[PDB]
From a paper:
Flavin-dependent halogenases are potentially valuable biocatalysts for the regioselective halogenation of aromatic compounds. Flavin-dependent halogenases require an associated reductase to reduce FAD to FADH2, which is then oxidised by the halogenase and O2 to give C4a-hydroperoxyflavin (FAD-OOH). It is then suggested that chloride attacks the distal oxygen atom of FAD-OOH to generate hypochlorous acid (HOCl),22–24 which H-bonds with an active site lysine residue positioning the electrophile in a spatially defined orientation relative to the aromatic substrate. With PrnA, the carboxylic acid and the amino group of the Trp substrate are engaged in a series of hydrogen bonds to tyrosine (Y443 and Y444), glutamate (E450) and phenylalanine (F454) residues; the indole moiety is stacked between aromatic amino acids (H101, F103 and W455), with an hydrogen bond between the indole NH and a backbone carbonyl group (E346).
In light of this, we sought to engineer PrnA to improve its activity and regioselectivity with anthranilic acid through structure-guided mutagenesis. It seems unlikely that anthranilic acid could contact PrnA active site residues Y443, Y444, E450 and F454, as tryptophan does, while remaining proximal to the catalytic side chains of K79 and E346. Consequently, a series of PrnA mutants were produced with selected active site residues mutated to lysine or arginine. It was reasoned that the additional basic amino acid residues might make contact with the carboxylate group of anthranilic acid to enable tighter substrate binding and effect the orientation of anthranilic acid relative to the catalytic active site residues, thus altering the regioselectivity of halogenation. On the other hand, mutation of F454 to lysine and arginine shifted the regioselectivity towards para, with increasing 5-chloroanthranilate (4a) produced (38% and 46% respectively), while also increasing relative activity by 4-fold in the case of F454K compared to the wild-type PrnA. Following further mutagenesis PrnA double mutant (E450K/F454K) was found to display a 16-fold increase in activity compared to the wild-type, producing predominantly the para chlorinated product (4a, 54%). In order to rationalise the effects of the selected mutations on the activity of PrnA, X-ray crystal structures for F454K and E450K were determined at 2.4 and 2.3 Å respectively. Electron density for all active site residues is present and it is evident that K454 is orientated towards the substrate binding site and the catalytic residues K79 and E346. Attempts to obtain a structure of F454K with anthranilic acid bound were unsuccessful most likely due to low binding affinity of the substrate.
Numbering used by the authors:
A (entry chain A), B (entry chain A): 2 to 517
Write the structure that this text describes.
């Protein structure tokens, strides 16, 4: 079969230029890549939070080190997500916060530290799980950097940045390496009688043709949804939020510092993200239109940060779910054109480079073997649905009942058999999927991580944080006092590391300043 | 809940004493373990072949190094399985053999060497896959040891031994560490109205009681099948063989050497195993009674090795399949009481210590939370069904059509959706599950291996060996000539290692002799 030689990418957002960059890197020879993007249709970039695999899977593949791209996007460091007022109904006299931290939890004789902690709590141990099982939460409370002053890594971390800038960065990178950039707007898509994309008709009268089309046109799904009629699976029965009111809020970093984490502040009919950068933090009230009006949500958002009625706002709406098939005929959907999930766990950009990773792993020729796209589509389904369930697990697990929104999350959600099964195992006291701690190649081979994205530690951070604990500790531990004693030594070690971090880490602000 | 304190194991075979050994090791405190075995009911031990996880998962857990247990069981080294006359109808003028080797296949720019080999074959490359992608097949042809004379490991390996002796070894090991051994025969099992095992009535009038019962009574399933009425899922529609005629055959190792591998010699209505040890090799014609009589199979077996009509034979029969649930109420089935699969891929003893591993991971208290057994049962189902599909893939893939037996395997088998999906992906040219080569922690964390037992390399050895190749090479490779060039360097390196092994390895016989 003849190889794919001409590729057309529709879209100049984060998805489009990640696709252009990744493909021009992966396809070293025999690859003509063209990207068309409309100047009259804006890109989505609200100030985004990410996860560590952005470096390992995407930028490492491009050969771009962290020190190269991060200052070009005015990046800040992210070491966790802090959930505020998610556990109980808001009480100004109560400190309601917990962290979902990056990194793996140590194992002790084949059992994660989370389970040794639970047994301790049964006997009266008061300290919260993540403060016992991780070394960095207290450091995050102190708004400290994830690295020493000399740049030595001290904890797993990701990044906060304006996605507009990473698109510009990748634009310059990809164009320099041969990607043809076209500023124009597609107005019509022509299919043959078979149903394959023949050509694209633009606004300036250009006719674009290719062997392979990549749809990065955003939520509208110009190619995959509108032209190819691939149905979008609405999953509003799984998750309730469908809107957002967002803006940027100035921050006096000199006296307030820069929080080295994303915040998720539970509201009456949703939650508000806080994504710190230098000089400001991006913020957005994600809400359900069925429980609050955009007007009311706007008022709550302004009141939360004490913003004025003159503050410019980014009014957003979206549909939760995914296409039935991400790849149909000769068109691959990447980004918002493929799927969407509320930014509760920073999975948006992850969906992009994870899908691109899978596209190269299933790269077609001009014959377009349906076995390739079928396999690709199955991977996308697994990827999205797994993250959807993890996010949903934040909702039906909550104890809040103060508003109709939270009551609905507790009782009226549709749950997959998969997430029901995990929760059942968790409640039984069983550890979920764990990996080796004294190895960490889980982060080095993406096939492993892609198929097992969320581990025991991730779920425990969420569940224990929301106050939903297993019925009992592992029955096995009653037979292994030596293992229990060994776990105590590990807890003590974590406590010592936390104390060392407190006096060794520079503030996140000072470290970000040293990088200018 | 009160902890499990009294445990009764029924059975003194390989399963029973592995269970006794593993549990007395895992349950350091609060564990009274009793094993009852009948002296009038023999154990099954035909001379068994194993896989490397026996050391990593079982003996390492007991703290017993290879050098300790192997000479106690008169063990020989196994480095692969050689399949003879499986590809085509037997032709004495043709050499029909291929190896299924232990170990992982190297990756080159995210693609296994198997796929770079396939592309080469498309362009005329003649050398068989496993001889190109592995360094040791030629060494195995030369009957060389898997280690240097000084004991330095040179290739991944497992073991051949009489399972009777490993049972005796573990018996002595477990009894010395507190396991109570009872020589008697259970004649009646009493259940309460709930359906839980109350007590065991023996032949000498003893009444045995416990919190937890382990059924290692063999194929009869004294507790799980007969008492608890748990249905056995007959899978004769998946696999056709149901019988075996076996014996031991003397070998002049001084002039013939000792083959460092198990052989699988395809017959008219089944296949014959060859499991070499010092001084002899165990052998057994596995056959389907629906295509040949035991009498005819016996004659073929004797004729194959030139044995006489006076040669004592072990006439065996079995049912292929598994219990619907491995663990019911307060009874856990381990070994032949749980499931059986023909020894095509040496999975029998694997099923034992893998299940025991899972039992400890799901260890109950006296309340017996059904969530624990449900989770355990699901793992057993995955374990068996996955190995069943892998074994079955040897059968429906063959090109042989010379007998009704092989025609039936080609056309009349029932295939799971899972195996159909894998074959489809393979035929499309896609790599199956792969792991990191420059790491090998896949063999260090059993959770990983248990869920992903058979990798791309394993399937490729079987499929390419049977002459069933993908329709085409990976389309991506047409865009990456640099990766192709890089793979050539790896092939050259493997060729050099093979040449070094040829002149460096002692013969398997001489090395086994040096260990006496
Ligand atoms: C409210 C919100 C919060 C988010 N938070 C996070 C987060 O915290 N972390 C994270 O990682 N991700 C997050 N995401 C996701 C992420 O921001 C976006 O998915 C990503 O940055 C851009 O996706 P996209 O490029 O596919 O869509 P878009 O940004 O909409 O890109 C659309 C592009 O296609 C072009 N185009 C469209 N139509 C046509 C046409 N007819 N002809 C020609 N050209 C055309 C447009 O000009 C534009 O260039 C969030 C998304 C939203 C909506
Ligand atoms: C033909 C064949 C080939 C095989 N090849 C391989 C191979 O190559 N590699 C591999 O790893 N595995 C292989 N296996 C599997 C392996 O040999 C056996 O599964 C294992 O060695 C023994 O299994 P078991 O102990 O559960 O059953 P058994 O050996 O039958 O043990 C039964 C025990 O339960 C006791 N018992 C029974 N009944 C009663 C009662 N009413 N009261 C009291 N006590 C009782 C018996 O006395 C006996 O001790 C093979 C099996 C077969 C049949
Ligand atoms: Cl997101
Ligand atoms: Cl076996």
């Amino acid at each position: 079969n003849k190889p794919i030689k001409n590729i057309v990418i529709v879209g100049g957002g984060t998805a489009g230029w990640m696709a252009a960059s990744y493909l021009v890197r992966a396809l070293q020879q025999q690859a003509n890549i063209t990207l068309i993007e409309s100047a009259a249709i804006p890109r989505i970039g609200v100030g985004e939070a990410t996860i560590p695999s952005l470096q390992k899977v995407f930028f490492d593949f491009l050969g771009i080190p962290e020190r190269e791209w991060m200052p070009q996007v005015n990046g800040a460091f992210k070491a966790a997500i802090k959930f505020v007022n998610w556990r109980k109904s808001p009480d100004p006299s109560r400190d309601d916060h917990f962290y979902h931290l990056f990194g793996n939890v140590p194992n002790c004789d084949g059992v994660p530290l989370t389970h040794y902690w639970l047994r301790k709590r049964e006997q009266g141990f008061q300290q919260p799980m993540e403060y016992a099982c991780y070394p960095q939460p207290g450091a995050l409370d102190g708004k400290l950097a994830p690295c020493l002053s000399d740049g030595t890594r001290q904890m797993s971390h990701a990044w906060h940045f304006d996605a507009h800038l990473v698109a510009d960065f990748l634009k310059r990178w990809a164009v320099e390496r041969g990607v043809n950039r076209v500023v124009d707007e597609v107005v019509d898509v022509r299919l043959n009688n078979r149903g394959y994309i023949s050509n694209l008709l633009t606004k300036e009268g250009r006719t674009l043709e290719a062997d392979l089309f990549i749809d990065c046109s955003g939520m509208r799904g110009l190619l995959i949804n509108q032209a190819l009629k691939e149905p979008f699976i609405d999953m509003s029965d799984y998750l309730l939020c469908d809107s957002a009111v967002a803006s940027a809020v100035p921050n006096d970093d000199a006296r307030d510092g820069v929080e080295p984490y994303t915040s998720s502040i539970a509201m009456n009919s949703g939650w508000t993200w806080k994504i710190p950068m230098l000089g400001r933090f991006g913020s957005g009230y994600v809400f359900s239109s069925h429980f609050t009006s955009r007007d009311q949500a706007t008022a709550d958002f302004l009141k939360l940060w004490g913003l004025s009625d003159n503050q410019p706002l980014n009014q957003i709406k979206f549909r939760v779910g995914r296409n039935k098939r991400a790849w149909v005929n000769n068109c691959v959907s990447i980004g918002l054109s493929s799927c969407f999930l509320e930014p509760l766990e920073s999975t948006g950009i992850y969906f992009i480079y994870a899908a691109l990773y899978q596209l190269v792993k299933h790269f077609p020729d001009t014959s377009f073997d349906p076995r390739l796209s079928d396999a690709f589509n199955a991977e996308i389904v697994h990827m999205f649905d797994d993250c959807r369930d993890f996010v949903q697990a934040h909702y039906f697990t909550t104890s809040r009942d103060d508003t109709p929104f939270w009551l609905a999350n507790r009782h009226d959600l549709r749950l997959s058999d998969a997430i029901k099964e995990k929760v059942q195992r968790y409640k039984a006291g069983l550890p979920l999927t764990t990996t080796s701690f004294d190895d960490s190649t889980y982060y080095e081979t993406f096939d492993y991580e892609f198929k097992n994205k969320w581990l025991n530690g991730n779920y425990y951070c969420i569940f224990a944080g929301l106050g939903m604990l297993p019925d009992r500790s592992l029955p096995l531990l009653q037979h292994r006092p030596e293992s229990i004693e060994k776990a105590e030594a590990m807890f003590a070690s974590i406590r010592r590391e936390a104390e060392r971090l407190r006096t060794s880490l520079p503030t996140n602000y000072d470290y970000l300043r040293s990088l200018r």
